Amino acid sequence: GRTVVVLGGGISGLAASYHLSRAPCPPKVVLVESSERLGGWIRSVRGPNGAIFELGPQGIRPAGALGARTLLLVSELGLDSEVLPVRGDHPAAQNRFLYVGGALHALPTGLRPSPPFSKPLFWAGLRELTKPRGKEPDETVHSFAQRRLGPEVASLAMDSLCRGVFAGNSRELSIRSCFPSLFQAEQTHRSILLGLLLGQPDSALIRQALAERWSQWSLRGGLEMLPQALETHLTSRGVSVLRGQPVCGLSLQAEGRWKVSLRDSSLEADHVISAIPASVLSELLPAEAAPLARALSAITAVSVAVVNLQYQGAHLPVQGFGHLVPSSEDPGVLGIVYDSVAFPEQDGSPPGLRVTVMLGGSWLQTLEASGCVLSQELFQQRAQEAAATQLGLKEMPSHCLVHLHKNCIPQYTLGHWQKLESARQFLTAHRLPLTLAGASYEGVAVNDCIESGRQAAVSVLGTE
Ligand SMILES: Cc1cc2nc3c(=O)[nH]c(=O)nc-3n(C[C@H](O)[C@H](O)[C@H](O)COP(=O)(O)OP(=O)(O)OC[C@H]3O[C@@H](n4cnc5c(N)ncnc54)[C@H](O)[C@@H]3O)c2cc1C
Ligand SMILES: O=C(O)c1cc(Oc2ccc(C(F)(F)F)cc2Cl)ccc1[N+](=O)[O-]
């Protein structure tokens, strides 16, 4: 008669519920979602022409053990036939670009100065092994990048990269929290390079991904297919999914059970897995849990406006994954993904070139703090100018989608590890039957969030 309530029906909540429900002697699971739909930021639109437009992740990187674990999840859900891979025999898999100095420049692979870098990067990697080692417990991605790789690398590479992964500022982000490997490598070995030159699930799908060397994958009906298959598996196992039911309050009681307070009803839980945003959870917590709520409230998230653009009979200047825009080149336009290069089967019919412009940065952030009106037009125009200037697409978009995603990518700023440590210390010291999960904590990628929900599920199962 043990009940586990999962807050939030994003990919984290979905995965947590999925792993709970699949245990041999599973508890009653209730998944509680505030909105009308499940899947969180993972969301796909089927446009009029049958094209697919992604409102969240444009596709998934099968990188490392977590990449592999996600492909396993996909196999378990029987989504094999829907999988669209980008195989190592194409440039979408082999071409990242930076827009710097009125031009696209290919980023290096391995193998001579490469514009916009004045010297060949070999010389920077060299002085990298020689670089001492940060003695501070935490350090910003910028400070870390500069110190070990040089100002150009810091300003063109890590600036852009933080924008591509976190839609965020390398001058504010923690190297320790945002790029753990880079940080451990430097900490343990005395150089990023050495620590990496010095060091997994299995299934047919994984094996293929390795064999064909996938740089990423997606689903035919769009990524939302993943959250959708998960939900479908949940209800078919009697898991109880509540949609349209914000959680309004959390409190403990006699027998250390949780009362989960909805709008106009309540649930009793022996355990709660919180897969909602840290700052939301924060506001849900009972006055006794104030120190945990403080730690949670210190975790914030940037917004990102996603603009999907389709042109009929247009073509790109180059072929690649997409291109990133450094902040010194534009504070509002983070980068553009070349959807048709990776996933031409999603171009609809008549087929038309598709790109996705990610807007955000301090442009969007200063605007949110302004009295300015954040209209569809404002975003449409920004994305179009960028498409026109950075890709030479002076044609009018034949289709356009605009979505302003409020507070959608948690930012792991300096001290973030300590907020996590405090939360965990409090949770364990007071034996709260509460488990944190999701993008707010130990990684924002979908792969990370899935894993985060699995770990949550696993640890709650270990307390019957
Ligand atoms: C545009 C953009 C592009 C991205 N691209 C990629 C990429 O390609 N690759 C990649 O790996 N990752 C990508 N991501 C990041 C990744 O998609 C997210 O970090 C991840 O999906 C977040 O999942 P989550 O479960 O942790 O949170 P969420 O998806 O935000 O889910 C949390 C859910 O909890 C719900 N909730 C809130 N309050 C309550 C309440 N009180 N009661 C019940 N429910 C509540 C919310 O409605 C929400 O649905 C991208 C993100 C953005 C937005
Ligand atoms: O590598 C990337 O993540 C990359 C992302 C791009 O677009 C984004 C996708 C998602 C986000 C996100 F998730 F941070 F919002 C930002 C950007 Cl700029 C464009 C280009 C690239 N790239 O490597 O050439």
| Tokens of residue 175, six digits | 């190297």
Residues near 227 by beta carbon (within 8 Å), at least 6 away in sequence: 10, 11, 14, 38, 39, 40, 42
Residues 334/163, Cβ–Cβ less than 8 Å:
yes
Q: Evaluate whether 170 touches 142 at the Cβ level (below 8 Å).
A: yes
**Domains detected in the chain:** 1-464 (3.50.50.60)
**What method did the depositors use to determine the structure?**
X-ray
Number of neighbours of residue 226 by Cβ within 10 angstroms: 28
Contact 141, 175 (CB under 8 A): yes
CB of 166 shorter than 6 A to ligand 2: yes
CB 16 within 8 A of CB 273: yes
Neighbours of 63 (CB within 10 A): 14
Ligand 1, from 250, 364, 446: best to mutate by most atoms within 8 Å of Cβ? 446
Instruction: Indicate the SS3 state at residue 165.
Output: helix
Tally of CB atoms within 10 A around 103: 12
Which contiguous run of DSSP H or E holds residue 294? helix 290-297
* Euclidean distance between CA atoms 426 and 295, whole angstroms: 10
* Ligand 2 atom nearest to CA at 166: 14
Spatial neighbors of 389 by CB under 8 A, at least 6 apart, are none
Ligand 1, atom 5, lies closest to the CA of 57
Q: At what angle do helices 180-188 and 141-149 cross, to 10 degrees?
A: 50
C-beta 321 within 6 A of ligand 2: yes
CA dist 307 → 239, 348, 427 (Å): 35, 17, 40
**Kind of pairing, strands 3-7 and 271-274?**
parallel
Best CA proximity match to 277, nearest among 36, 13, 2, 92: 13
Tokens of 292: 């945990």
State the distance from the centre of ligand 2 to the C-alpha of 9, rounded, in angstroms.
24
Ligand 1 pocket by C-beta < 6 Å: which residues? Answer: 7-13, 32-35, 40-42, 56-60, 246-247, 275-276, 280, 304, 306, 405, 408-409, 438-439, 444-447, 449
CA of 268 to the centre of ligand 2 (A): 41
CA–CA gap between residue 44 and residue 49 (Å, rounded)? 14
Q: Which atom in ligand 1 lies closest to the alpha carbon of residue 452?
A: 26
Query: Which of 48, 2, 44 shows the shortest CA–CA distance to 27?
Result: 2
116 preceded by a cis bond (ω within 30 of 0): yes
Ligand number nearest to the C-alpha of 360:
2
Nearest-CA residue for ligand 2 atom 10 is: 164
> In the chain, after which residues does the backbone break, taking C–N over 2.5 angstroms as a break?
111, 199
223 Cα–ligand 1 center, Å: 13
Q: Which atom of ligand 2 is nearest to the CA of 334?
A: 18
The atom of ligand 2 lying closest to the CA of 167 is 14
List CB contacts of 44: < 8 A, sequence separation 6 or more: 52, 53, 54, 55, 221, 222, 223, 224, 225
- Report the separation in Å between the CA atom of 435 and the middle of ligand 1, taken as the mean of its atom positions: 17
CA 306 to ligand 1: nearest atom: 1
Looking at 193-321, which runs of residues are DSSP E strands? 216-219, 240-242, 249-252, 258-261, 266-269, 271-274, 301-311
42 CA to centre of ligand 2 in angstroms: 15
Ligand 1 centroid to residue 211 C-alpha, Å: 31
Residue among 88, 132, 133, 86 nearest 109 (CA): 88
Q: Are 364 and 406 in contact (CB under 8 A)?
A: no
Residue 205 structure tokens = 């799908």
Type and span of the H or E element at 142: helix 141-149
Which position has the token pair 């690649």? 320
* Resolution rounded to one decimal, in angstroms: 2.6
Go through 241-268 and write b for each residue having 16 or more CB atoms within 10 A of its CB, e for each that does not.
Answer: bbeebebeebbbeeeebbebbbeeeebe
Residue located via tokens 């291109």 = 323
Q: Cα–Cα distance between 88 and 213 in angstroms, integer?
A: 5
Beta strands in 55-92 (DSSP E): 83-86
- The closest alpha carbon to 457, from 146, 36, 69, belongs to 69
Question: Relative to the alpha carbon of 38, which ligand is closest?
Answer: 1
The two tokens of residue 287 are 């006055």
Of the candidates 277, 255, 234, 250, the one whose C-alpha atom is nearest the C-alpha of residue 434 is 250
CA 200/CA 66 separation, integer angstroms? 8
CA quadruple 37, 38, 44, 48: dihedral sign: negative
